[PDB]
Structure formats: C-alpha cells, structure tokens
Write a protein that binds this ligand. Structure first.
Ligand SMILES: Cn1cc(-c2[nH]cc(C(=O)N[C@@H](CC(N)=O)c3ccc(F)c(Cl)c3)c2-c2ccc(Cl)cc2F)cn1
Length: 303
C-alpha cells in the first residue's frame, strides 16, 4: 500500500511549477526542477523550501544527482545548452554543458562519464574535461526510435542506444535488438543480465528473448535502489505532462505485476529515496488541457 505521507508545492508561486525530482544525498531533502528552469531543495516532510538555484532559461525536464553529492545533471526544453553538469561542492556552479543533448545520464559504477542523447545519437563525455569522447551512431543498425534515451549498463562496459548494444571500449556495435515498437529504446536491468526494451526482455549474453511483459508498453521505467521493484509509467502520446495518470509496479526478479496505481492526475516524474522507504511523485493538480500547470509533490511510504 502506497500510503500518503506529505504533499507540498512550489512555495508562494501563484502556479506551482515542479517538473522533476530526485532525492539529494541528505535525508529528508528532495531536489526538484521547475518549469522556469530552477533547481529547488525542499524538506519533503515539512514541505518547506530550503534553497533555489538558477539552471536554465526553460523548463527542466529531468535531473540526476551523482551518488556522492558532488555533481548534478539537468536537461531542459528549449535552452542552449540543452543539458548541463553542475558542481555542488562549496558553490553551485556550471562545470560543463552539453549543448545539443536533450537527455543526459551518469555512468553507473564509476560516475566519471556522462552519456547524452540527441535523437537516435549517443554522445559520451568525460566529466573532468567535458570533452566528447565518442559519438555512437551506426546507420546500418539504427532502429530510429522516436523516444530514444541512451544509457550505460551497470558496469559501464556497454551502452544501449536506439536498441543497439555498443562495446564502449572498442566503440563498436555488437548487436541490434529487433524492433517491436515506434518509441521506447530500452534500459538495462540492474541485475546486469537482461535488457528491457519496451515489452521485450532480452538475455544480454545470448540475445534470446526471455519474456514478454505487455503492461510495459510505452513505459519509462525506474528501479528502486535495492533492485527489487520496477516502476513503469506510460508516456502520453509550454511543457505537457510526459506521463498519464497511472504507474505500475513489477517484481524485478520475475517481472510479475504487483500494483497498478491511478493517481487521477497527470504524472511528471517519480523517484525513490536512497533507502527505498518512500516514493515522491510530481502530479499536476490542474491539466495542461486547460493550460493549467500547478503541480504538487506527493510523498508516499512504500508498503
Ligand atoms: C518534457 N519531458 C519530460 C520528460 C521526463 N520527465 C520525467 C522522465 C522520466 O523518465 N522519469 C523516470 C524517472 C527518472 N527521473 O529517471 C520515470 C520512470 C518511471 C516512471 F513510472 C515515471 Cl512516472 C518516471 C522524463 C522522460 C520521458 C521520456 C524520455 Cl525518452 C526520457 C525522459 F527522461 C521528458 N521530456
């Protein structure tokens, strides 16, 4: 049972503009991006704003803090640069930018690289220099997914871009996964053994199709930190809500559905705390069908 614990909004704004979230390295504090390009730090229990920083001149779509608390990735809608890396030690400052990448992620084991996505193209950057180390795109193997998002595997040896598996060291495509949908390009399971591409679950070693999970169709997915639960929310077909009003949970060990939660409001983002005690969900109290952006963050205790 996802038990509500707290609710809060962007303080003292006529219309609340939270768009995305991630827990900080400090217990009790959530980082939220906003539709005017700010980063906010909030106490999730009191609902009070602690700090605000200026990141972009357009809506933040997504953000990701490094596990060590030293760095932050942000992505925006229209800005130049589209994505950026921020230092959060001593002073909040821009370390590097990624001008044309509309989505960025850290590498997973050692967080020394950033992978950015531009359409069906992946770009790998060094955190220290900001230099682009690699561009990954093979015209012969492209799936041309419409909502592609390039990603590292748990040990940072492989990248999945546009449904193509790349060996990062050789910068060579080693396998193209067959196309079953127009949009979703896929993620690695944290177990290191499986690739989840829309409804298809592939074995990474043999490239065999292991399972079909129809309820994952058109979903973005995130796992809890401990890798026991997978959350999926279906994309929707100024910033409109990326998701509909529902999310689904699955057992990460066997892909069996656990719960389907309809929050009856469009969802902008979802995350868990580092101890996987809580779920924070950004939900629009209004609707952009009426051009009303007025989001809240809802905090739930996971059952
Ligand atoms: C205007 N705009 C908003 C987005 C966006 N916002 C949140 C996104 C996003 O992907 N959020 C992740 C979690 C995370 N923070 O990584 C998520 C995963 C499972 C879910 F059930 C839910 Cl509700 C969200 C995303 C998102 C959606 C699609 C893609 Cl391909 C990439 C994204 F980052 C993107 N554009």
């Amino acid at each position: 049972a996802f038990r509500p614990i707290s609710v809060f909004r962007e303080a003292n704004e006529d219309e609340s503009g939270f768009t995305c979230c991630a827990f900080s390295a400090r217990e009790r504090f959530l980082m939220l991006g906003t539709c005017t390009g700010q980063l906010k730090l909030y106490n999730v229990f009191s609902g009070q704003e602690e700090a605000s920083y200026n990141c972009h001149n357009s809506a933040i779509t997504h953000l990701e803090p490094s596990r060590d608390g030293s760095l932050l990735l942000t992505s925006a809608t229209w800005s130049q640069p589209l994505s950026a890396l921020w230092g959060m030690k001593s002073v909040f400052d821009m370390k590097h930018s990624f001008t044309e990448d509309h989505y960025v992620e850290f590498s997973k084991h050692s967080q020394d690289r950033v992978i950015g996505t531009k359409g069906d193209i992946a770009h790998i950057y060094d955190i220290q220099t900001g230099n682009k180390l690699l561009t990954l795109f093979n015209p012969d193997l492209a799936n041309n997914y419409k909502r592609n998002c390039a990603t590292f595997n748990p040990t940072d040896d492989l990248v999945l871009n546009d449904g193509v598996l790349w060996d990062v060291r050789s910068a060579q495509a080693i396998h193209k996964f067959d196309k079953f949908n127009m949009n979703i390009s896929g993620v690695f399971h944290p177990n290191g053994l499986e690739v989840i591409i829309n409804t298809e679950i592939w074995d990474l070693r043999t490239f065999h199709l292991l399972h079909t999970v129809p309820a994952l169709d058109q979903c973005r997915v995130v796992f809890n930190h401990t890798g026991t639960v997978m959350y999926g929310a279906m994309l929707q077909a100024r910033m409109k809500s990326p998701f509909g009003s529902s999310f689904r949970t699955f057992n990460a060990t066997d892909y069996k559905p656990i719960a389907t939660i309809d929050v009856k409001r469009n969802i902008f983002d979802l995350c868990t705390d580092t101890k996987d005690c809580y779920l924070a969900v950004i939900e629009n109290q209004g609707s952009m069908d009426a051009l009303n952006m007025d989001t809240v963050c809802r905090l739930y205790e996971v059952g």
